[PDB]
Copies of this chain bind each other. A is one copy, B any other.
Amino acid sequence: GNKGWEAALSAIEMANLFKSLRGTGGSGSSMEIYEGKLTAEGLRFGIVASRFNHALVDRLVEGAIDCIVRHGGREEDITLVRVPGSWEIPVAAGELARKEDIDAVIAIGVLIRGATPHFDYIASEVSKGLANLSLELRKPITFGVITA
């Protein structure tokens, strides 16, 4: 039940939700409640991770993959991209999020804000970029990072 499991759980629910919204509406006669299920048969995902501190990141990525397969996901339908550092996560995510096949992208990384001097500037940028990216491209982007 590591934090990587949480990111996968959030990602799966949205891919179903947006499908329901884009689909045909209800028959009326009451409040149109829209909900996202946990099924994962026929959903494609993407993941981005940083090389830095590969001893503490390998566990996170591995735990995330177990969530999809257990909930009914084929291992063949996952794409993995690795980037040098945390600063480069947003730009990489954009290329993945713009593909037609992909339906969700997860973000995994570790932060050293406070662990090293002069890092709060970089720390705020990644959080701001990923959220702002989601609105323009119309697609859920789960967020996950650790503090060192």
Contacts and interface: CB of A to CB of B under 8 A. Distances in A.
Contacts of A31: 65, 75-80
Copies of the protein in its oligomer: 9
A10 B84 contact: yes
B128 A88 contact: no
A63 B80 CA distance: 20
Contacts of A75: 30-31
Interface string A29-62: 1111111111101000000000000110001000
Contact of A133 (B9, B80, B116, B135): B135
In this complex, the interface size class of chain A, counting residues with CB under 8 Å from chain B, is: 35 or more
Contact of A90 (B41, B111, B135): B135
28 contacts: A1-B54, A2-B54, A10-B88, A17-B81, A17-B92, A21-B95, A32-B78, A34-B79, A34-B80, A34-B81, A36-B82, A36-B83, A36-B84, A37-B70, A39-B39, A90-B135, A91-B134, A91-B140, A95-B138, A113-B118, A113-B121, A114-B117, A116-B147, A117-B146, A117-B148, A118-B143, A122-B127, A122-B143
Given A90-B134, A113-B118, A116-B147, 9 more contacts: A13-B84, A17-B83, A22-B95, A31-B76, A38-B38, A88-B142, A91-B141, A111-B118, A121-B123
